[PDB]
Write a structure and sequence with these properties.
Chain A is α/β, with parallel strands linked by helices. Chain A has 16 helices and eight strands. In chain A, strands 3-2-1-4-5-6-7-8 form an eight-stranded mixed sheet. Chain A starts with 14 loop residues before the first strand and ends in a 5-residue tail after the last helix. Chains in contact: A-B, B-C, C-D. At the B-C interface, β8, α9, α10, α11 and α12 of B face β8, α9, α10, α11 and α12 of C. The structure holds magnesium ion (8 copies). The site of one magnesium ion has 2 residues of chain D, from loops. Chains A, B, C, D: One of its GO terms (biological process) is isoleucine biosynthetic process.
Chain lengths: 326, 326, 326, 326
Amino acid sequence: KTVLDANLDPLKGKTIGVIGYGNQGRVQATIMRENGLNVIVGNVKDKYYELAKKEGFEVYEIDEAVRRSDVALLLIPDEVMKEVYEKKIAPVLQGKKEFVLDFASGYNVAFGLIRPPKSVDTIMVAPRMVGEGIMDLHKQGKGYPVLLGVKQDASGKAWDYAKAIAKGIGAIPGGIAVISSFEEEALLDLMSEHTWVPILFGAIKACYDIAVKEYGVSPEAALLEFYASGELAEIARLIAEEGIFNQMVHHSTTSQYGTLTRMFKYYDVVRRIVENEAKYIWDGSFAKEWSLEQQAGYPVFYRLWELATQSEMAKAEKELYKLLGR
Amino acid sequence: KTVLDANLDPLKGKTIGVIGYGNQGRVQATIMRENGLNVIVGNVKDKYYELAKKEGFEVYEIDEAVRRSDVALLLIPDEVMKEVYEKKIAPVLQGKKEFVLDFASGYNVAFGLIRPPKSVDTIMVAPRMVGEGIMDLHKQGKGYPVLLGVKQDASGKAWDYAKAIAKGIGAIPGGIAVISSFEEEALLDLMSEHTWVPILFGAIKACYDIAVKEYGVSPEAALLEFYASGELAEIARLIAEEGIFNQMVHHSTTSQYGTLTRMFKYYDVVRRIVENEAKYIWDGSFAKEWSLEQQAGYPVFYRLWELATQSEMAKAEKELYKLLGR
Amino acid sequence: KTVLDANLDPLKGKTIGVIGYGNQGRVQATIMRENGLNVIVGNVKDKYYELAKKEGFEVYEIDEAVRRSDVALLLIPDEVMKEVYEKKIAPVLQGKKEFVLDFASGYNVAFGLIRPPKSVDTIMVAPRMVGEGIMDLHKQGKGYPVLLGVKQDASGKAWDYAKAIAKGIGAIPGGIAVISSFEEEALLDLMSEHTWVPILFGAIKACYDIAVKEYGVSPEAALLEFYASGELAEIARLIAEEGIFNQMVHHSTTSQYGTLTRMFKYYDVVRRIVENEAKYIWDGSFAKEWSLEQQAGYPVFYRLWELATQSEMAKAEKELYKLLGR
Amino acid sequence: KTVLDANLDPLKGKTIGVIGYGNQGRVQATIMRENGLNVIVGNVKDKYYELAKKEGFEVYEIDEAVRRSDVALLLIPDEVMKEVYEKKIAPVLQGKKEFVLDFASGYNVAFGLIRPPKSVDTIMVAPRMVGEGIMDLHKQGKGYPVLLGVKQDASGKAWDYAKAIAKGIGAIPGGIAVISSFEEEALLDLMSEHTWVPILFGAIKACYDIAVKEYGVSPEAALLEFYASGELAEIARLIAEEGIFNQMVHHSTTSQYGTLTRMFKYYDVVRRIVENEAKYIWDGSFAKEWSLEQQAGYPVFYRLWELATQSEMAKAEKELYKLLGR
Ligand SMILES: [Mg+2]
Ligand SMILES: [Mg+2]
Ligand SMILES: [Mg+2]
Ligand SMILES: [Mg+2]
Ligand SMILES: [Mg+2]
Ligand SMILES: [Mg+2]
Ligand SMILES: [Mg+2]
Ligand SMILES: [Mg+2]
């Protein structure tokens, strides 16, 4: 139920606009120039203004490139986007007869922090890669999977454009493209950062605090078996090629037994962590308190860095990295 | 312990100001002109500026009409009021020797979002009607009940003015006027919207989700017995004339039994919903998080509309209304 | 999955019987006479015997009209029906070769208090209206939705008759007709009276008892904001035309926020009230204790009227209605 | 707030009717004859018909004496009363222009098992005595306290009659008369039999079952210290003259200490027994299941006699009473 190839002639001929030359602009713009598209980099004058000029692009101010644009691509970070949509693009969108605007981030649109007008058809292309492996896969030849999705279709030409950009940026063919929504992309981007990542760090921290403080393990020997040596980077490489359970036939017989007997044991415990976290994002509740942490000036984001950089596990790895040569 | 008639000569002679020509300005201003009062409509130039000019009123800017005013009436909505009191009226209140200012909304004043000075005696007139039945009752002859209330009396002439406006707008005689506070009007306006309205919609939604998903009722037949036919509008008309329990002698004998045996049964369950909701508003807690939802940009107000307009009950009534001719 | 028109010739030609000239007999009989049907009113000699004679009908005793009937319609109340089916119709149903009998009330049949024989095909027509709006909609031209349903089909001609009466009484065309069962009509008639009606009265009663007894609101001011003024009749009229949530765009922004944040909050609390009430009726448990309250002589129905007519909220609205002129 | 004397001329001159010559008819009728009142005993022909004839009264059938009556007194038991009101008095009450009817039992009227018409003014006189001490106090000279109470006053002459009968039966002067309701007399008659009487028997039974079955007391020695000797009849005589706590100064110092330290200790435990029993009667719930026990044929009243007459405490006192000579 995915799409694999399409027509490039919808976005061809016209001049696509690119906003920001950041971590996607150094990546996605050069591929779109290679497919025969007039791309114009929008960026206010900073350090990133230079590299866009240095690598052969015509570059202008942010609100001026969307004037000369026909297809808009908005590749800027998520926490600065709401005020630059409102102070730069919001005065000029009232002159567009037909317009398409493209976000790589469902967080600002799905929770209604950015509401585009009727005439501006908003869509989404969300790359599933590091970003630092795109140009390698652009060099090698294959693609990379992306999520597509429409929010407002006031012309009927949404999927004429929604697949043509995924053809344009070199995602397909070679990779796939999954039709989805704006709301599902915002959920999977956030629930992966709220359910299985902070559980994982809190479990590696809790295995340090149990073994050192009770069982008398040396503080240098605990880190070498938890993350300071590479088993985490070894338990992660095999999932990308063989599967999640299918890499476990490269282990000892004992290691598969104690894993499988506990993975089905603690599943009901960790389901209630996840299912309470998913409704928390689905209500728009998390988008509110991340919007209030920015207005308060990050007092809770600041203290939790000092409680995490002065942890005993975070102190112990500091001297250990001045011992491995790192 | 209510008041029924008073003297009009306190607000007579001077020129009363009217701020905003909205849902009260199209209503309350024409009645005050009929009682022999110099009323002057304050409204910034918009669509509502036209109808105030179109129906024979002298109209000016918002902060300019309170200059020429002697008695101020502030009939503008509640969420825009704090910044237009602070940017338009707050520069000019420092020129008033004697002044009375009148709010139809206790929410902005009782929680201290609007603090008027000493010399400006603030009072309240709160109409108890639809608003769309005023001019009918103005046509017929009777009145409509209102809530009165003083907050700051720095002259002694508060109830000389607090009853004269209720005499002026045609509330009394014909209706009554209840002396109250600013804090009690803010409580009854909000606890009716927080206790028995969202319980009622959540109970009609829960009867759909029980009958369809379990007992195999047709999705078109469930709505015709819950709200799509008129029993709710039939169970509501008889309370306005006969009483809350006194309309139940127009029902079957079985319908009174199953109601009364359950109304006294679930009373202790729904008391704890109400009594926890009333202290939540009495602490000023709700006024805080409604003030933070506006600054965050309504992310939780936005998501809960999409969860309520994509409900299965809200989808099922859409096709049903393209079936009754509605 | 509803039916909109059918054939009238099944019930045409023969003489349909009508039992009782009550709240449906003054309504449903005159429409059936207008469609070219020989209707004969059955009623024992009382006050309702007169108006059936007064408005041009041939009228007889109850058990005698079903002798001359070919199609039976039984429009009598629910609490008297079991003994008049058993003492008047039960001697004479043993002479019918072919017969159809029609109840407007699923409560007596679905719980097995009335068990008709094999040869008597029992069906249901259940009007979804006030009853006092039928003749207006008969005057205007449109119809009104009804529930259909068969219980015993011992001829194959059930839906030949089950739609012909809905065509006969003027329900369709103009309204719809939903095919259902006897058991589903008894459930939706009773669970609306047991779940969201007695919760609603118990919540308006609990908002009086919280505001007056604790927060010091005046007892005359509490009723004017809960039901004595018309917002309940204003919050009910807009649901009949626009929808349940679609009428909330006629409100203030604050009123939609505090409603939607609490309607999704108390939904899990009020689901357990409903889902325990629906299995209580589905077991036939409620039909038992309403049958025992009648045999005990209503001692619990009597006391709960005195506890509800001597409530402080029910006392306070009495003097208030001698103050509005009501 | 009690009444002590009144006028006898309201019930004087006319002929008062007396229904039943039972435990009150052998008592209350002879006193009313002594005050100069035409009393006529109504009783169907049984054993009690004889003693009413034997002691000089004119006696008739039950429904015939209320024909010749002007003031009705209904001194018959409570479980037979509903069907003899309905089959004997209910045909003849439709001939009375003015009538007063008097019950000595609030249980049948307060729960609505007997509903008299408009023209029949129903009142209550409830004697507070054994019944077997009336004629002694009639011999000695003093009176006995009674409860008065009106239910329906459709003439204004209720308390003209409600005190004249208490003057007539020799209650006042010498005793008092307390104005009350029908509902309060039914509550105090039943909650004394449901709260402190069955707790008391269940506590004397539980002290037998603890001492014999565990602590090895002889089964003949346990009864002599609980009820078979007279301390219960000794702890009861002193309350009637001195008070409930004021009789405790006739005891040992130790007996007052262990009583008072435990009476305030178990008060919160036995309050929840009482307060759940009082709402059970106030809802009319007990009147329902006593009405259903009669229709079922007393299966639960029958088994609980056999479980109480075959108790080990009830067996042990049988041989003990063939040992004291009782
Ligand atoms: Mg991600
Ligand atoms: Mg290993
Ligand atoms: Mg309101
Ligand atoms: Mg009904
Ligand atoms: Mg109904
Ligand atoms: Mg409102
Ligand atoms: Mg007693
Ligand atoms: Mg002693």
